[PDB]
RNA sequence: AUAAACCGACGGUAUUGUUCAGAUCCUGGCUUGCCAACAGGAGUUCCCCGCGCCAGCGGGG
């Protein structure tokens, strides 16, 4: 679960070794973190995920509170309160509503993980210029990040596959902070602006599925359904045991 | 053994056809190259040779 267990790849703001923390450790400490992945595009995909998460779990009621939470980390009790009604929507492996997935996908073959690795494959020259086996075994964090990247920044897999709400390959622009905690909070719209931004079906595509060949008025989409939009029918396979993430 | 390694930008293709540079036109007038002068001096020629009066005369290279 993205709200509970460790999955966030960080290292100290000016420190060294990578450690995998959880959302609570990020929101409830004056520790300075910065995202750390081998790819800048995945670091951005991760931040986008974090921001979209913090957008639904803790919009400030006003600018006064907005400035307060930035300078002051929440307490673990406040955090648990806020994440409580959302735990149900952030499960990777889940019975009826897997995170950004769709149970019951009819496919003759199993798609390799490289197809979510945005650029490792996609062109006829990729197999010649890129290193093989980058997607043989992806950890939980990278998998979610990759899924979120495909739905937002990357183009569709091919014919019959749709792209995100902003279209194919949009430019994402976030306000930069001093550390990871501040940056995430800095990009969360306060409740008033949130209402002015979105004046609907406010349930995800993996809980309230999209109907085939249906026409959807853009105004009929809730902000959480849109932020976590999944234009593609994707279903993860059963994972494997302990080892290095490729 | 380095965003490295392995690794063609490739294949075909007339720039062609036409066209006086042409008519007229002194380079022209003047102007010593000039003064002096034995082609004479100087016997080296290195050999072989034959005949002398020892001075010098000959034939071969």
């Amino acid at each position: 679960n993205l709200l509970i267990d460790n999955w966030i790849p960080v290292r100290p703001r000016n420190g060294g070794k990578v450690q995998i923390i959880n959302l609570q450790s990020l929101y409830c400490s004056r520790d300075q973190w910065r995202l750390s992945l081998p790819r800048d595009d995945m670091e951005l995909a991760a931040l986008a995920l974090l921001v979209c998460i913090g957008q639904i779990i803790a919009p400030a009621k006003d600018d006064v509170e907005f400035r307060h939470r930035i300078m002051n980390p929440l307490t673990e009790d406040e955090f648990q309160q806020l994440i409580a009604p959302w735990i149900d929507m952030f499960y990777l492996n889940h019975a009826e509503h897997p995170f950004m997935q769709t149970k019951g996908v009819k496919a003759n073959d199993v798609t390799p993980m490289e197809k979510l690795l945005a650029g490792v494959s996609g062109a006829t020259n990729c197999a010649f210029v890129n290193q093989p086996g980058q997607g043989e075994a992806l950890c939980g964090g990278c998998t979610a990040i990759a899924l979120f990247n495909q739905a937002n920044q990357a183009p569709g897999f091919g014919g019959g596959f749709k792209s995100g709400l902003r279209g194919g390959t949009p430019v994402t622009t976030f306000v930069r902070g001093i550390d990871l905690r501040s940056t995430v909070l800095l990009n969360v719209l306060t409740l008033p602006r949130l209402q002015k931004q979105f004046p609907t079906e406010n349930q995800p595509t993996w809980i309230k599925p999209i109907k085939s060949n249906e026409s959807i008025p853009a105004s009929s989409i809730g902000f959480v359904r849109g932020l976590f939009w999944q234009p593609a029918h994707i279903e993860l396979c059963d994972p494997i045991g302990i080892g290095k993430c490729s």
Side-chain angles (χ1 to χ4, degrees), chain A residues 128-131:
Chain A
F128 188 82
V129 301
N130 286 325
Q131 176 79 1

mmCIF file with all atom_site columns, all heavy atoms in Angstrom, chain A residues 128-131, chain B residues 4-7:
data_model
loop_
_atom_site.group_PDB
_atom_site.id
_atom_site.type_symbol
_atom_site.label_atom_id
_atom_site.label_alt_id
_atom_site.label_comp_id
_atom_site.label_asym_id
_atom_site.label_entity_id
_atom_site.label_seq_id
_atom_site.pdbx_PDB_ins_code
_atom_site.Cartn_x
_atom_site.Cartn_y
_atom_site.Cartn_z
_atom_site.occupancy
_atom_site.B_iso_or_equiv
_atom_site.pdbx_formal_charge
_atom_site.auth_seq_id
_atom_site.auth_comp_id
_atom_site.auth_asym_id
_atom_site.auth_atom_id
_atom_site.pdbx_PDB_model_num
ATOM 1   N N     . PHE A 1 128 ? 19.202 -1.950 -30.054 1.00 0.00 ? 128 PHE A N     1
ATOM 2   C CA    . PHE A 1 128 ? 20.595 -1.818 -30.447 1.00 0.00 ? 128 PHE A CA    1
ATOM 3   C C     . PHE A 1 128 ? 21.364 -0.824 -29.571 1.00 0.00 ? 128 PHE A C     1
ATOM 4   O O     . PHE A 1 128 ? 22.537 -1.026 -29.298 1.00 0.00 ? 128 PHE A O     1
ATOM 5   C CB    . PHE A 1 128 ? 20.681 -1.406 -31.915 1.00 0.00 ? 128 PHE A CB    1
ATOM 6   C CG    . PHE A 1 128 ? 22.073 -1.421 -32.473 1.00 0.00 ? 128 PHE A CG    1
ATOM 7   C CD1   . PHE A 1 128 ? 22.646 -2.601 -32.906 1.00 0.00 ? 128 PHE A CD1   1
ATOM 8   C CD2   . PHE A 1 128 ? 22.803 -0.250 -32.586 1.00 0.00 ? 128 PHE A CD2   1
ATOM 9   C CE1   . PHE A 1 128 ? 23.923 -2.619 -33.426 1.00 0.00 ? 128 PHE A CE1   1
ATOM 10  C CE2   . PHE A 1 128 ? 24.081 -0.262 -33.106 1.00 0.00 ? 128 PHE A CE2   1
ATOM 11  C CZ    . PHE A 1 128 ? 24.641 -1.451 -33.527 1.00 0.00 ? 128 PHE A CZ    1
ATOM 12  N N     . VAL A 1 129 ? 20.713 0.243  -29.119 1.00 0.00 ? 129 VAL A N     1
ATOM 13  C CA    . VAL A 1 129 ? 21.438 1.276  -28.382 1.00 0.00 ? 129 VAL A CA    1
ATOM 14  C C     . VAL A 1 129 ? 21.295 1.155  -26.867 1.00 0.00 ? 129 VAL A C     1
ATOM 15  O O     . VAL A 1 129 ? 22.125 1.668  -26.121 1.00 0.00 ? 129 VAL A O     1
ATOM 16  C CB    . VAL A 1 129 ? 20.998 2.699  -28.813 1.00 0.00 ? 129 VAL A CB    1
ATOM 17  C CG1   . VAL A 1 129 ? 21.234 2.896  -30.300 1.00 0.00 ? 129 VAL A CG1   1
ATOM 18  C CG2   . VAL A 1 129 ? 19.540 2.958  -28.455 1.00 0.00 ? 129 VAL A CG2   1
ATOM 19  N N     . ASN A 1 130 ? 20.259 0.465  -26.408 1.00 0.00 ? 130 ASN A N     1
ATOM 20  C CA    . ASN A 1 130 ? 20.025 0.354  -24.977 1.00 0.00 ? 130 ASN A CA    1
ATOM 21  C C     . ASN A 1 130 ? 20.525 -0.955 -24.368 1.00 0.00 ? 130 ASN A C     1
ATOM 22  O O     . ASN A 1 130 ? 20.680 -1.959 -25.056 1.00 0.00 ? 130 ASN A O     1
ATOM 23  C CB    . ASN A 1 130 ? 18.540 0.528  -24.676 1.00 0.00 ? 130 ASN A CB    1
ATOM 24  C CG    . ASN A 1 130 ? 18.091 1.967  -24.795 1.00 0.00 ? 130 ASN A CG    1
ATOM 25  O OD1   . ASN A 1 130 ? 18.840 2.888  -24.478 1.00 0.00 ? 130 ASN A OD1   1
ATOM 26  N ND2   . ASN A 1 130 ? 16.869 2.169  -25.259 1.00 0.00 ? 130 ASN A ND2   1
ATOM 27  N N     . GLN A 1 131 ? 20.792 -0.912 -23.067 1.00 0.00 ? 131 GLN A N     1
ATOM 28  C CA    . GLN A 1 131 ? 21.157 -2.087 -22.294 1.00 0.00 ? 131 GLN A CA    1
ATOM 29  C C     . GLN A 1 131 ? 19.945 -2.981 -22.055 1.00 0.00 ? 131 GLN A C     1
ATOM 30  O O     . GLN A 1 131 ? 18.899 -2.506 -21.617 1.00 0.00 ? 131 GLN A O     1
ATOM 31  C CB    . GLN A 1 131 ? 21.765 -1.672 -20.957 1.00 0.00 ? 131 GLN A CB    1
ATOM 32  C CG    . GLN A 1 131 ? 22.095 -2.823 -20.029 1.00 0.00 ? 131 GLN A CG    1
ATOM 33  C CD    . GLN A 1 131 ? 23.384 -3.525 -20.402 1.00 0.00 ? 131 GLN A CD    1
ATOM 34  O OE1   . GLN A 1 131 ? 24.061 -3.145 -21.356 1.00 0.00 ? 131 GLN A OE1   1
ATOM 35  N NE2   . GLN A 1 131 ? 23.734 -4.556 -19.643 1.00 0.00 ? 131 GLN A NE2   1
ATOM 36  P P     . A   B 2 4   ? 27.639 6.230  -27.036 1.00 0.00 ? 4   A   B P     1
ATOM 37  O OP1   . A   B 2 4   ? 28.388 7.452  -27.395 1.00 0.00 ? 4   A   B OP1   1
ATOM 38  O OP2   . A   B 2 4   ? 26.774 5.578  -28.040 1.00 0.00 ? 4   A   B OP2   1
ATOM 39  O "O5'" . A   B 2 4   ? 28.724 5.185  -26.542 1.00 0.00 ? 4   A   B "O5'" 1
ATOM 40  C "C5'" . A   B 2 4   ? 30.045 5.598  -26.247 1.00 0.00 ? 4   A   B "C5'" 1
ATOM 41  C "C4'" . A   B 2 4   ? 30.848 4.467  -25.668 1.00 0.00 ? 4   A   B "C4'" 1
ATOM 42  O "O4'" . A   B 2 4   ? 30.211 3.993  -24.457 1.00 0.00 ? 4   A   B "O4'" 1
ATOM 43  C "C3'" . A   B 2 4   ? 30.969 3.222  -26.532 1.00 0.00 ? 4   A   B "C3'" 1
ATOM 44  O "O3'" . A   B 2 4   ? 31.979 3.336  -27.521 1.00 0.00 ? 4   A   B "O3'" 1
ATOM 45  C "C2'" . A   B 2 4   ? 31.252 2.139  -25.507 1.00 0.00 ? 4   A   B "C2'" 1
ATOM 46  O "O2'" . A   B 2 4   ? 32.612 2.199  -25.108 1.00 0.00 ? 4   A   B "O2'" 1
ATOM 47  C "C1'" . A   B 2 4   ? 30.393 2.603  -24.331 1.00 0.00 ? 4   A   B "C1'" 1
ATOM 48  N N9    . A   B 2 4   ? 29.065 1.956  -24.285 1.00 0.00 ? 4   A   B N9    1
ATOM 49  C C8    . A   B 2 4   ? 27.853 2.506  -24.608 1.00 0.00 ? 4   A   B C8    1
ATOM 50  N N7    . A   B 2 4   ? 26.836 1.700  -24.443 1.00 0.00 ? 4   A   B N7    1
ATOM 51  C C5    . A   B 2 4   ? 27.419 0.537  -23.971 1.00 0.00 ? 4   A   B C5    1
ATOM 52  C C6    . A   B 2 4   ? 26.878 -0.705 -23.598 1.00 0.00 ? 4   A   B C6    1
ATOM 53  N N6    . A   B 2 4   ? 25.577 -0.989 -23.650 1.00 0.00 ? 4   A   B N6    1
ATOM 54  N N1    . A   B 2 4   ? 27.731 -1.657 -23.166 1.00 0.00 ? 4   A   B N1    1
ATOM 55  C C2    . A   B 2 4   ? 29.036 -1.369 -23.115 1.00 0.00 ? 4   A   B C2    1
ATOM 56  N N3    . A   B 2 4   ? 29.663 -0.241 -23.436 1.00 0.00 ? 4   A   B N3    1
ATOM 57  C C4    . A   B 2 4   ? 28.787 0.683  -23.862 1.00 0.00 ? 4   A   B C4    1
ATOM 58  P P     . A   B 2 5   ? 31.722 2.806  -29.013 1.00 0.00 ? 5   A   B P     1
ATOM 59  O OP1   . A   B 2 5   ? 32.877 3.190  -29.843 1.00 0.00 ? 5   A   B OP1   1
ATOM 60  O OP2   . A   B 2 5   ? 30.365 3.202  -29.429 1.00 0.00 ? 5   A   B OP2   1
ATOM 61  O "O5'" . A   B 2 5   ? 31.698 1.220  -28.880 1.00 0.00 ? 5   A   B "O5'" 1
ATOM 62  C "C5'" . A   B 2 5   ? 32.822 0.479  -28.427 1.00 0.00 ? 5   A   B "C5'" 1
ATOM 63  C "C4'" . A   B 2 5   ? 32.446 -0.966 -28.213 1.00 0.00 ? 5   A   B "C4'" 1
ATOM 64  O "O4'" . A   B 2 5   ? 31.442 -1.041 -27.174 1.00 0.00 ? 5   A   B "O4'" 1
ATOM 65  C "C3'" . A   B 2 5   ? 31.817 -1.655 -29.418 1.00 0.00 ? 5   A   B "C3'" 1
ATOM 66  O "O3'" . A   B 2 5   ? 32.797 -2.244 -30.251 1.00 0.00 ? 5   A   B "O3'" 1
ATOM 67  C "C2'" . A   B 2 5   ? 30.871 -2.682 -28.800 1.00 0.00 ? 5   A   B "C2'" 1
ATOM 68  O "O2'" . A   B 2 5   ? 31.556 -3.888 -28.506 1.00 0.00 ? 5   A   B "O2'" 1
ATOM 69  C "C1'" . A   B 2 5   ? 30.480 -2.018 -27.482 1.00 0.00 ? 5   A   B "C1'" 1
ATOM 70  N N9    . A   B 2 5   ? 29.163 -1.366 -27.521 1.00 0.00 ? 5   A   B N9    1
ATOM 71  C C8    . A   B 2 5   ? 28.878 -0.069 -27.869 1.00 0.00 ? 5   A   B C8    1
ATOM 72  N N7    . A   B 2 5   ? 27.607 0.231  -27.773 1.00 0.00 ? 5   A   B N7    1
ATOM 73  C C5    . A   B 2 5   ? 27.024 -0.941 -27.317 1.00 0.00 ? 5   A   B C5    1
ATOM 74  C C6    . A   B 2 5   ? 25.698 -1.281 -27.011 1.00 0.00 ? 5   A   B C6    1
ATOM 75  N N6    . A   B 2 5   ? 24.674 -0.436 -27.122 1.00 0.00 ? 5   A   B N6    1
ATOM 76  N N1    . A   B 2 5   ? 25.450 -2.535 -26.589 1.00 0.00 ? 5   A   B N1    1
ATOM 77  C C2    . A   B 2 5   ? 26.475 -3.380 -26.480 1.00 0.00 ? 5   A   B C2    1
ATOM 78  N N3    . A   B 2 5   ? 27.765 -3.181 -26.735 1.00 0.00 ? 5   A   B N3    1
ATOM 79  C C4    . A   B 2 5   ? 27.972 -1.929 -27.157 1.00 0.00 ? 5   A   B C4    1
ATOM 80  P P     . C   B 2 6   ? 33.115 -1.650 -31.705 1.00 0.00 ? 6   C   B P     1
ATOM 81  O OP1   . C   B 2 6   ? 34.490 -2.062 -32.051 1.00 0.00 ? 6   C   B OP1   1
ATOM 82  O OP2   . C   B 2 6   ? 32.763 -0.212 -31.725 1.00 0.00 ? 6   C   B OP2   1
ATOM 83  O "O5'" . C   B 2 6   ? 32.106 -2.423 -32.660 1.00 0.00 ? 6   C   B "O5'" 1
ATOM 84  C "C5'" . C   B 2 6   ? 32.154 -3.837 -32.775 1.00 0.00 ? 6   C   B "C5'" 1
ATOM 85  C "C4'" . C   B 2 6   ? 30.810 -4.410 -33.143 1.00 0.00 ? 6   C   B "C4'" 1
ATOM 86  O "O4'" . C   B 2 6   ? 29.904 -4.283 -32.032 1.00 0.00 ? 6   C   B "O4'" 1
ATOM 87  C "C3'" . C   B 2 6   ? 30.080 -3.741 -34.296 1.00 0.00 ? 6   C   B "C3'" 1
ATOM 88  O "O3'" . C   B 2 6   ? 30.507 -4.229 -35.550 1.00 0.00 ? 6   C   B "O3'" 1
ATOM 89  C "C2'" . C   B 2 6   ? 28.611 -4.055 -34.023 1.00 0.00 ? 6   C   B "C2'" 1
ATOM 90  O "O2'" . C   B 2 6   ? 28.217 -5.248 -34.674 1.00 0.00 ? 6   C   B "O2'" 1
ATOM 91  C "C1'" . C   B 2 6   ? 28.581 -4.266 -32.503 1.00 0.00 ? 6   C   B "C1'" 1
ATOM 92  N N1    . C   B 2 6   ? 27.805 -3.223 -31.805 1.00 0.00 ? 6   C   B N1    1
ATOM 93  C C2    . C   B 2 6   ? 26.618 -3.636 -31.205 1.00 0.00 ? 6   C   B C2    1
ATOM 94  O O2    . C   B 2 6   ? 26.312 -4.832 -31.262 1.00 0.00 ? 6   C   B O2    1
ATOM 95  N N3    . C   B 2 6   ? 25.848 -2.734 -30.566 1.00 0.00 ? 6   C   B N3    1
ATOM 96  C C4    . C   B 2 6   ? 26.229 -1.463 -30.535 1.00 0.00 ? 6   C   B C4    1
ATOM 97  N N4    . C   B 2 6   ? 25.436 -0.602 -29.905 1.00 0.00 ? 6   C   B N4    1
ATOM 98  C C5    . C   B 2 6   ? 27.430 -1.011 -31.151 1.00 0.00 ? 6   C   B C5    1
ATOM 99  C C6    . C   B 2 6   ? 28.183 -1.917 -31.780 1.00 0.00 ? 6   C   B C6    1
ATOM 100 P P     . C   B 2 7   ? 31.149 -3.244 -36.634 1.00 0.00 ? 7   C   B P     1
ATOM 101 O OP1   . C   B 2 7   ? 31.660 -4.036 -37.770 1.00 0.00 ? 7   C   B OP1   1
ATOM 102 O OP2   . C   B 2 7   ? 32.067 -2.330 -35.927 1.00 0.00 ? 7   C   B OP2   1
ATOM 103 O "O5'" . C   B 2 7   ? 29.915 -2.403 -37.167 1.00 0.00 ? 7   C   B "O5'" 1
ATOM 104 C "C5'" . C   B 2 7   ? 28.801 -3.034 -37.780 1.00 0.00 ? 7   C   B "C5'" 1
ATOM 105 C "C4'" . C   B 2 7   ? 27.612 -2.108 -37.813 1.00 0.00 ? 7   C   B "C4'" 1
ATOM 106 O "O4'" . C   B 2 7   ? 27.389 -1.609 -36.468 1.00 0.00 ? 7   C   B "O4'" 1
ATOM 107 C "C3'" . C   B 2 7   ? 27.774 -0.882 -38.711 1.00 0.00 ? 7   C   B "C3'" 1
ATOM 108 O "O3'" . C   B 2 7   ? 26.542 -0.560 -39.351 1.00 0.00 ? 7   C   B "O3'" 1
ATOM 109 C "C2'" . C   B 2 7   ? 28.163 0.224  -37.735 1.00 0.00 ? 7   C   B "C2'" 1
ATOM 110 O "O2'" . C   B 2 7   ? 27.760 1.512  -38.128 1.00 0.00 ? 7   C   B "O2'" 1
ATOM 111 C "C1'" . C   B 2 7   ? 27.453 -0.194 -36.452 1.00 0.00 ? 7   C   B "C1'" 1
ATOM 112 N N1    . C   B 2 7   ? 28.189 0.219  -35.248 1.00 0.00 ? 7   C   B N1    1
ATOM 113 C C2    . C   B 2 7   ? 27.578 1.022  -34.287 1.00 0.00 ? 7   C   B C2    1
ATOM 114 O O2    . C   B 2 7   ? 26.405 1.363  -34.445 1.00 0.00 ? 7   C   B O2    1
ATOM 115 N N3    . C   B 2 7   ? 28.272 1.396  -33.196 1.00 0.00 ? 7   C   B N3    1
ATOM 116 C C4    . C   B 2 7   ? 29.533 1.016  -33.044 1.00 0.00 ? 7   C   B C4    1
ATOM 117 N N4    . C   B 2 7   ? 30.178 1.410  -31.948 1.00 0.00 ? 7   C   B N4    1
ATOM 118 C C5    . C   B 2 7   ? 30.190 0.211  -34.010 1.00 0.00 ? 7   C   B C5    1
ATOM 119 C C6    . C   B 2 7   ? 29.488 -0.155 -35.083 1.00 0.00 ? 7   C   B C6    1
#
